[PDB]
Amino acid sequence: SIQAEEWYFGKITRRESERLLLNAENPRGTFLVRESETTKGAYCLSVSDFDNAKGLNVKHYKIRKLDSGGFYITSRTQFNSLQQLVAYYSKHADGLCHRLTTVCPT
Ligand SMILES: CC(=O)N[C@@H](Cc1ccc(OP(=O)(O)O)cc1)C(=O)N[C@H]1CCCCN(Cc2ccc(-c3ccccc3)cc2)C1=O
Prior knowledge:
The protein is an alpha+beta fold. It has one domain: SH2 domain (SHC Adaptor Protein), CATH 3.30.505.10. The chain has helices spanning about 15-20, 80-90, and strands spanning about 10, 30-35, 45-50, 55-65, 70, 80. Strands 1-2-3-4-5-6 form a 6-stranded mixed β-sheet. The radius of gyration is 13 Å and the shape is globular. Bound molecules: the ligand CC(=O)N[C@@H](Cc1ccc(OP(=O)(O)O)cc1)C(=O)N[C@H]1CCCCN(Cc2ccc(-c3ccccc3)cc2)C1=O. This is Proto-oncogene tyrosine-protein kinase Src. It comes from Homo sapiens. Belongs to the protein kinase superfamily. Tyr protein kinase family. SRC subfamily. It is found in: Cell membrane; Mitochondrion inner membrane; Nucleus; Cytoplasm, Cytoskeleton.
């Protein structure tokens, strides 16, 4: 159950995800997964980043789920579950702003 996952914040807004992530104590890769405001059946992986150009900032990645079963940000790299997706991106940055590190504090 994704609702069982501590990083799954459910039905929170994009502005709210940003408020929680834009905390000076959050290292790069601090994250949370929430429902998408705009796409039914889709989720959003919100991630904190930091660089000298932009300072502390947030990136949002749409996660799609096939009726066929797979979860993915890019269709070339799919997972059998949202949890396997989160585990993969915690080890590989690939196209993300940073690999996922720890769950966002509320
Ligand atoms: C308005 C906005 O912020 N849009 C997001 C996408 C997005 C995210 C959530 C969402 O619901 P909400 O309405 O609930 O918020 C709507 C749109 C976006 O555009 N992100 C960027 C993220 C940084 C990379 C650029 N990009 C394209 C891209 C390119 C490569 C990858 C990629 C990631 C991992 C592995 C391989 C490729 C991901 C995104 C985005 O989508």
